[model samples]
Target chain A: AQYEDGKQYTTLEKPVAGAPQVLEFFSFFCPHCYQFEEVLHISDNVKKKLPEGVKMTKYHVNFMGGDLGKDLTQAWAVAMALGVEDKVTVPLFEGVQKTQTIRSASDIRDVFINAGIKGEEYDAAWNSFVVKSLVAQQEKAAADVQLRGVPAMFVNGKYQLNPQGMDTSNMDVFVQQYADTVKYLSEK
Target chain B: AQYEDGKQYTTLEKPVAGAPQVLEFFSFFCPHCYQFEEVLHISDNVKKKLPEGVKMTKYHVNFMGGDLGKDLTQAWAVAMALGVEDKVTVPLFEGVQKTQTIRSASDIRDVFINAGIKGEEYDAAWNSFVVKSLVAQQEKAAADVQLRGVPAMFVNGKYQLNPQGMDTSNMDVFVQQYADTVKYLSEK
Candidate 1:
């Protein structure tokens, strides 16, 4: 929920230039995140239609406390660190969304390799850098914050999708409202 | 998941009379809290055996975001505020557990009256003095900590039982472990 920017996990520290930032915190292991992504993509389209000064950035959460989920998340950090997010995010998301046979990291690795990333290069990024530590730090941070759930979107650093908001069926609408509120606050 | 000691919600805000501090965070519509009575009774037996410096408290969570849940929680808060924990704790839990109803402030007042407490006594407690803002503060606290589920317990705000711990097949063992942990920390 409350992420200390630049500390635990990959910061995805892309600053919005002259834009109101849309920041999302999500975990790959979360089924809700997967389900939410469809709506989020539409939100992204809606975002593109917004006037200038509106932008969105998402950071994958790595605090599921399992080795494989951590590996998957670290892969994301690897992509981000290598600046392959533009090349990797959509394909990786599609791979998970489409392939039932591909459950292991090896299979996911193959998908990334097929997408033109060298497995060695990806491995180098995965193994040598601060990604794994960032993951460990994220796990510690989740424990520190005692986060109860995932797919939390923080507007700037203060407001979040109210945990007490209407249920998931109406969540996208609430999120849209929340986005509008954020827009209002930023302009103010 | 975390509670501030010496806060108003602290059971018996008075100096310790050496009772077992039993904190029950429940919901009006939460069926699980409704079913938790047997365990709570067993816990009472366990409580009678506690050493000194032990006490018990209950906080009804209004995490549901409706007037009904909010009302029951306020009754609990009033009990805390007035230091009449013993007067209302067991009965409120019993009514919710037995009736599967605590949906309104009136229902809570009725239960108190049905249990021989004066109906008029509960009137003022039904308002803002008792019902906490963000009534599901306990869940919010745990959710803040990234907990996936509830029926969780903590000892002195440190050792939190995993959600799986609540599902253990042996009830006595689980409850005893809880008692022992509380006892262990009370002395520490």
Candidate 2:
């Protein structure tokens, strides 16, 4: 149920319009992520400045970090092996963060139903090999990304974006600052 | 003209018992000192913070910072052989900057008269060993203090301070900021 290298990412993972993408690796329990979320959610001025064809993806990182590691690892491995990853990922994240402890695989299944999956389909999707594999791929990619903290981001695969430990409420200002850095790279 | 190896300063030249002190050593043409004066003139907050025992004294560094070296060398030799130097110090600084050139020691004597010394006192001061040696003390002290830039400061001997150079108007905030450094040292 752990991540295996080399098979998780395919050519399709790269940008479809072929512009560069930014990736943020995160964990649900990380307080920094919540802070960044408020900034990302509220900053309308920042949203207006996002460069065309630029995309941001957030991937959950659960291994060697906290209690959800094994279930998360197994889910990703199964997701990758089969092809039901898309149907399960968002719900699985919700489960890992639900107030009650998601102590095992069934706990993840219960949370999936809450996120709108039908009963039988939720069971099938929960442990599908493809869904499990995608989760594994995310874990391995996190390690390769060499992240130092949760809610950390990569800039055009060439630079690391950091918040410099400033206040969470100031994220919009920083995101705009990050956008300016990207704008400079775009012109260069 | 050149600094000697051994001299120490233990007291003010004309110590004022109860005035706040500022020791300003400067080159005549130094643009920094001119700009720093602007900071000094404004900032009532800075004035209010001044300790009662504070007064600023200005000293002139020799024109020997350039190549007209021999005149000052002989002048020092002659002044030391006699016993006068108060006559020569102001003239030396003023001559160098006023005439816009340090062509010779004679130019130094000329400016001394312009600054209002009579014949013998002016003549006597430039040749005194005490004056040249005292000037040497200031030059060495300025170096040991590890100044980042001129128009720099040592407030009350216990504190080293920065001027945080002004913009078009004074940097009132910074003047207060640096005053805080002085106040901090005064307490210690």
Candidate 3:
């Protein structure tokens, strides 16, 4: 079998209500997430393969970033709300997790500004209703997932993908199979 | 020709008062510090070569470990104060920075206990007068050096070893050269 219910997937108690979705639970400070961001390029690759309407949302996890864990999640929510995650993800992932060149909220804000987000724009969005509400939604989703660890992906808000079950021997094959699995589950 | 002051070594504002010494400013979360711990084995090898009465001290830097930066340094001081650093260092160093197996003070206490320290002893030393004083000393030493980065070593508290000054072409040569430099500066 390519995948099993309990083995390859676990059904969520309360599925997230959305048009078929792929939600990834990950930490910027997590090494595996760094590997995905740097080596696997999982986000970009997976996006290309998913069906047109299959919304892929990356939910920054709040458990693994140490004292700044939740804050990092909030920063990510800000990036998402500002529609700058596409530009912010790799830099933060590399800086915070790998290089450790960036350290605090101020440094994170600088990264957003460097990504064409205006300084004033960043401050206005930081704790605004939209960003704060997004942070709450992201955190609530983490709580709902009962997040065991990081780099976890759930398809259609129901089936959690089993990392060990994937064919990770080759990059192309891995992303293709992942996209295929997400596509298959979205149809269901 | 081998090493130079203001080039290979910078003179400290006020040198630490002691028998000729080698003090290292480092962070457990630093990757290069991990390489020194695991790959170079800089500690044991350097101690082996330092001349009699030449003391070695490791001052954990407070700037690099993020929100838990100083705390991690305090934990290291605890390990040293309890005389369990030889055992505690590898586990905490590897676990905190590389494997990420150990995350908090409780996890650190467990490593000490596993290394034959009683949980009570661990608790007593964590913030005891001796440990607290040692932590203060470490921080002060870090401040005294105006430390630039991790895995930095200063000889005789007066001569800060320039990383670029060392010949790191081979592991054996690297450690030997490092020890020799420490010894050379200790004499002066």
Candidate 4:
């Protein structure tokens, strides 16, 4: 498959410093993102195959979701702060995209509560400096990348991957090729 | 709270014999059933509180899934035969209800495969007399019950519960009350 800029990929002019990173920016509101996360579970599988010293970071973009966008981003940040993203992420995603149960910040509290996080713990983490900073960083990155669409991936924080013509022969190959692309860009 | 017949519940004229049972008749196609299983997780919690010798049995009804109904019921039987229902049930439920991925019996094999059940094991289980009998029993039970909707529950195969005036003050009380009701009927 072609890996040329504007073919299946493009390199960023300015790159994020200090590490080889694959950043996935997404919104809980995106149907494709729901399929990507829930159905394919590509991120979970790809992370396993990612090489040493390369990290995959999830960025919850607030470009969509209207009134709930920023709140959901903050929820993600809070989950990360409490180290409970495993329990919190999918429920919130399903709530927004499938159940439509979480309509406000207060409802987001119930998610963490159900995940065994106490209401106090959730509130404390929500106001924590680290979570606030993470949310701020994601918001800035969303704007800095000028991202018009989501479930988007960037490698070494500098390369954008377009999976349009990438290897999707099967799910295994699709995930393998995605990991390979990220690995190649990380080394570059 | 009322255990009177025809009030909160009614007793079957002919109860299922040989065991104290809590049978949940559900269809993957039912939205409320999905929520009951996935969102609320009532079955898992209630089972823990059930008295000894009282088994919780799931009957996957085929009246709702159109072409995929019997196939999915068979799929559940296969999962049960292989003791891999933990991995197969939810994926099949989500596939039918949420993802729309498992359309045929062949797609159902993928669910087993993903759960680490070998293709050979799945096929062997699918055509086995034990599995065939299970599917057959469930089919008969569905018809014999004269069920109109899914996610219906029965205690000792006799009492049908209506949660309308039950103690749904909170999740804990709700699940506890459900367990208590089943226990009362099981004893009767």
Query: Model 4 over residues B108-184: C-alpha lDDT tens digits?
Result: 88988888998998999989999999898888776665666667788766778665566655656766776677667
- Which pairs in model 3 have colliding backbones? none
Q: Each prediction's DockQ?
A: 0.02, 0.01, 0.03, 0.03
| lDDT for each residue of candidate 4 in A1-188, tens digit (9 for 90 to 100) | 54677766787677666423778888888755765676457687667767655577888888788878889999999987788888987888777755556778888899889989999889998899999998988887766666778888887667887765565424445556776676666677
Interface RMSD of each: 14.9, 29.0, 11.7, 8.0
- In candidate 4, residue A103 scores what lDDT? 72
- Which is the better candidate, 1 or 4, if ranked by TM-score? 4
Residue ranges of candidate 1 with Cα displaced over 4 Å:
A1-21, A42-55, A63-65, A90-98, A130-146, A163-175, B1-188
Q: Which stretches of candidate 2 lie over 4 Å from their true place?
A: A1-20, A42-48, A64-67, A73-101, A165-171, A182-188, B1-188
**Best-to-worst ranking by lDDT:** 4, 3, 1, 2
- Candidate 2 C-alpha lDDT tens digits along A27-80: 544534433442243123323566656665556677433656656655545444
lDDT of 1 by residue, A84-180 (tens): 7667666665554334324457766776797788989878877864777655645554443334566665444434444333322454664565455
TM-score of chain A of each: 0.65, 0.62, 0.88, 0.89
> On a 0 to 100 scale, what is the lDDT of residue A28 in model 2?
45
Docking class of 3: incorrect
- Candidate 1 DockQ vs. native: 0.02
Q: What is the lDDT of residue A109 in candidate 2?
A: 59
lDDT at B148, model 4:
63
Which stretch of 10 consecutive residues in model 3 chain A shows the poorest summed lDDT?
Answer: A166-175
Model 2's i-RMS, to one decimal, reads 29.0
Over the stretch B40-79, how does candidate 3's per-residue lDDT look in tens digits?
Answer: 7787787887787767777777553334556677788887
lDDT of 3 by residue, A38-121 (tens): 545676777787756657788887788676777788888888888888789877876674445466788888888888999998
